[PDB]
Ligand binder design. Structure first.
Ligand SMILES: *CCC[C@H]1O[C@@H](n2cnc3c(N)ncnc32)[C@H](O)[C@@H]1O
Ligand SMILES: *CCC[C@H]1O[C@@H](n2cnc3c(N)ncnc32)[C@H](O)[C@@H]1O
Ligand SMILES: *CCC[C@H]1O[C@@H](n2cnc3c(N)ncnc32)[C@H](O)[C@@H]1O
Ligand SMILES: *CCC[C@H]1O[C@@H](n2cnc3c(N)ncnc32)[C@H](O)[C@@H]1O
Lengths: 343, 9, 343, 8, 343, 344, 8, 8
């Protein structure tokens, strides 16, 4: 009956929140020093946005962000977490003698009740490629508890996409798929499944990092302004792109990364997952074309990245791209929920 | 059936 | 049905989604020990398949049914509940075996077969043999088996042996001690260290090891698939009494399994033992909460009790003591969520 | 976690 | 209506003999010091087989072998060449003051007329893989002019074949065929020809050299005895093989090389094109499988190589090989007249 | 029986079309981006010359040019091809869902029958040095299917000639031939064939590329207008030249390249193989003089390049040249069918 | 000899 | 389509 349960298969939500119940997964994100340190930097450097304020922390996990809000002078912090990690968060609140300022509220942010409106919302709603997990809609949904002119940390999110050339990666995945090309695997002809194997392997986004020399054009930006957007805006995301090739060669796909900005009263702090920046636990995301497109320097590669939200808390991505000069055209579908962790 | 957040370091 | 009564829907969804991926079929097929030995057992016992009715429980891509056809099977019913059954049908057609291999999508507890069979083939072994609870579907399929019919595999042996691995034991606390710091970004996390320790010890460790860490001849618990009922797997009590061949600290129990294809011509063995070439099942180890010192010649007695649960796996209770000293330890592990430590 | 561990 | 014209299409013969009319092609062969040095060694070390004897030189080109026979004291040497190189051979005979001993007779050995029977025939009838060019049949045909006690230089030919592993070579060829995989080459879908492209590229024998460590089993030998064989014996050449694999890995194809032996009265002299020997202009020849077979050390790779002579002065080669232990089977055809020169 | 067979030895035609039956040779040409890209732009950017028109594609190969004509909106395209590649083009027409618009006709354009006249002919008849392969004649022969005011893509072809200096290319010929100038190669005196070896190398036109700084005079141009020329005009091609030397030095031969122009209703597109342009699979062609000719800046190098068609689908090349100010003369005879591919 | 030279 | 491979 809640916004969450109507857009989410129970089976998906069970494993999703089960994953976040593990302390080792909290450690994994907390050890990302770029992510944790930049979050603390954004909050403390903008202490004026928290001093004697009312705060809501959506998906607080162990509560680290609420503790940062407390360090910045918050009057009262509501820390909403839907996994069993909420129990461990309450333990930390009591062991750090902050019961008078951090109030853990177990449950989904779409289902819990708060005693008052808040001045500012803090959260880490970013999945890999930004949009995975569909936590951004929960983050936006929480704005029902936000006073007018209330702030949000992060405030905006920039999605970047750029074409890349990586023949080794394309061959690595093509070689994997060519296992189903064998006409006599122990005497059995698999070749009929060759096509379906290619589809499956190339639907997998490749999550790892890469040298920036593989990019063949200036990135295109797609901005989500969390102060303005409605959760309905993320059900069908359409990202048009028109790249201007800076190098000639084979475009094997598009690389993705994201930045979020904490636009506070003292300064704007950026948290970037770009390949030009130190590595984070989000890495970067690349979508492979089944067949690379050939482009010349000065050519334009135009197309559209259409992200359709599914009830498994992820997106089905369709990427169509064409070299305008030759009409060479590539269409691809990706299952953002089945990534290939290559690093 | 993978993990929401990638393993790191 | 029998299957749905013992399985939570959330677990069954994610379980069969996993087996819907051609890449996961490929992972098992590429295991030469696994695939080769199954082929060897079926072909070298051709008289058990020549002009016979065959049932294949959980056929996946159908490789075992093709092996049964190579051995001269008259009619092969291949049952698979995951969407991989659609790919099996494709391979049946492309291999011109539609007249001999009938693919039936669905659970073996729910589908309908038109005739009894002479022999049932299957790969129902999970890691530690019992994970996935496929052995119960394999045994449940005997309602379609003609009297005096055979089963490939015919018996399953799970082996338990005590091991010493100081490094493995200590790394649990090394990982948990991340929480043992009084100011992680100004936050005191020490209150969750105990919860982190417990979380790691609930995880069986799936990887391989040098056989020199074993300190006693293994104890063997046999399941005879011809005689056993699926009720025999809801509660598996494995008493053990190890005659210690070496002196040292026993940190837990190591698990592997063998399986036998008792054919009319010969008996073929598929083994996942650490003394054999590695397989995709690796081996499984369960730690004691505390190590037990045992002199070479002592007896280390206790029980390993596996209790089936509705997550298609088992809760593992282990108690052990050094009889000559009375020193005791135990542990309780969740087989459904192991740690893949292999590098 | 996956029923059958990744293998090579 | 000669033997040559019956088995040879004229368009093939015109191009064939035009190639051998170029002095640059004579230089290419003559500068193969292994080839030229070994021929001179075989003749001079067996001078008694030539002293005051009548010699026939089949396909003499510029006449070098005839000069070697004259150095060994031959009384009369008939030097037959069907290409225009015969006129250049005449110039060298006169300029070397050997008009009294070397008589150039232009034409095809199947069509010219010799004034007398000869004691020994000398020739270089070996193409790459030995059999290409079908010059061996002209060599055997020339035995109509050979005395009963006569000899042949070379006397026998050994063809060796062995399985190799060379993933890079396989990927190299498959990358070229994958051009015809594109679904939008300048907006044109080429994928329908993908199959024909792979077939075309993999019917090409690869002519180059390789490191002997890529061989996975001891070579099998097929011997042609030029003293005993008849022309018709080379119309259909069937070379069965059973390899005992010495290493595990992917068998990407079979490698071919040949040895010829000059069995003289004084000593036997061998000319080898084996990859364990110094490189010659014949190099070695490899036939690639469209899909490699996987074999384990100790398996047997058995099959047959069938060479059917065609009217284009070459052979249509059929190679069938199977890993006996698993029934993995690969069938391949190769157009021996359309090789890929890779060096 | 047909115009093609009357002018082509059977043995030359078999080899010639077996070569073009290979997908690897189609791929070799298609991967030439200057070539394939310029044809596409010539056709698409003159869409009005193709929209709802009837098209003849002479020697279509894999049919790529017919697909560009369809992308331009042609109604009916007759794609003629004599090699076995015709069967591969038929597969692509089907798999690209164009069986209603493209009709593959296997056979020689001189022998097949077309059901109707066409509005425009498209082809790639250019061999190296333009004239090799003698495909231009099949292209002009095809005009029997062209309407009175129909067009041709390409519309004209320009071959360019220029004298070059390349001391190292010249000396390389004798370095190779001097293999024969030894008195005891394994005891045999080969020196009597050295002269024959030299003559053989000099008869080969050299196919590769070069720095434009080796050209010593502005190029002379010989033009074929495909809308007006007849087949017989290409049996004997006389190209007189009168080069006014821009640099002093030794002239070692003449360099050749060619451009074609697609003269459309909207615009004219040029495909150029000049050494000033990006390299194509045609490269450039150089024909050496038997002896170099010294010429000073300001001198005139006059002479004639005569191309005589032969029945091996190529030309015998006669080049004669002299420096007018000195009378120093040189010539050479070259077999265009057997060039030396020197590019590395 | 090849009517069209090998390219790239 | 040459009978003998170019050497060196
Ligand atoms: C990237 C980390 C997300 C974080 O938030 C929690 N989460 C996810 N979805 C949630 C809803 N709807 N309500 C509350 N918390 C929610 C995850 O468990 C994780 O800790
Ligand atoms: C270890 C591989 C198991 C294999 O069998 C399928 N499976 C699992 N449980 C099943 C039931 N109850 N009926 C039919 N098939 C079943 C798995 O999907 C996998 O392919
Ligand atoms: C490998 C060099 C062969 C050599 O022999 C000549 N040749 C080939 N076939 C011939 C027949 N039938 N008669 C005479 N000479 C023949 C080739 O021209 C080459 O020189
Ligand atoms: C340069 C590519 C030529 C191209 O055209 C074909 N061709 C050549 N000569 C032909 C005649 N007379 N009729 C039809 N096609 C013809 C070549 O095969 C190649 O594809």
């Amino acid at each position: 009956r809640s916004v969450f349960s109507e857009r989410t298969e129970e089976s998906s939500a069970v494993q999703y929140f089960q994953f976040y119940g593990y302390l080792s997964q909290q450690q994994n994100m907390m050890q990302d020093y770029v992510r944790t340190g930049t979050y603390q930097r954004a909050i403390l450097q903008n202490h004026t946005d928290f001093k004697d304020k009312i705060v809501l922390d959506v998906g607080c996990g162990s509560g680290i962000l609420s503790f940062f809000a407390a360090q910045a002078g918050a009057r009262k912090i509501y820390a909403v977490e839907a996994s069993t990690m909420a129990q461990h968060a309450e333990v930390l609140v009591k062991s750090n003698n902050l019961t008078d300022r951090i109030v853990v509220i177990p449950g989904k942010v779409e289902e819990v009740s708060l005693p008052e409106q808040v001045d500012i919302i803090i959260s880490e709603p970013m999945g890999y490629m930004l949009f995975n997990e569909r936590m951004l809609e929960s983050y936006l949904h929480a704005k029902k508890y936000l006073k007018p002119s209330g702030n949000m940390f992060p405030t905006i999110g920039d999605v970047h996409l750029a074409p890349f050339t990586d023949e080794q990666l394309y061959m690595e995945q093509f070689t994997k798929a060519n296992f189903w090309y064998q006409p006599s695997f122990h005497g059995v002809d698999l070749s009929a499944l060759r096509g379906a194997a290619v589809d499956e392997y190339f639907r997998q986004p490749v999550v790892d990092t890469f040298d920036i020399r593989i990019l063949m054009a200036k990135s295109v930006k797609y901005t989500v302004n969390f102060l303005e957007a409605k959760e309905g805006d993320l059900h069908r995301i359409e990202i048009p792109f028109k790249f201007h090739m800076l190098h000639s060669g084979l475009v094997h796909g598009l690389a993705f990364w994201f930045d979020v900005a904490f636009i506070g009263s003292i300064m704007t702090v950026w948290l970037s997952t770009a390949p030009t920046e130190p590595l984070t636990h989000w890495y970067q995301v690349r979508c492979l074309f089944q067949s690379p497109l050939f482009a010349k320097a000065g050519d334009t590669l135009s197309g559209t990245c259409l992200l359709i939200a599914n009830k498994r808390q992820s997106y089905d991505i369709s990427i169509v791209a064409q070299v305008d000069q030759t009409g060479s055209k590539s269409s691809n579908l990706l299952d953002l929920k089945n990534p290939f962790f290559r690093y | 059936p993978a993990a929401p957040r990638p393993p790191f370091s």
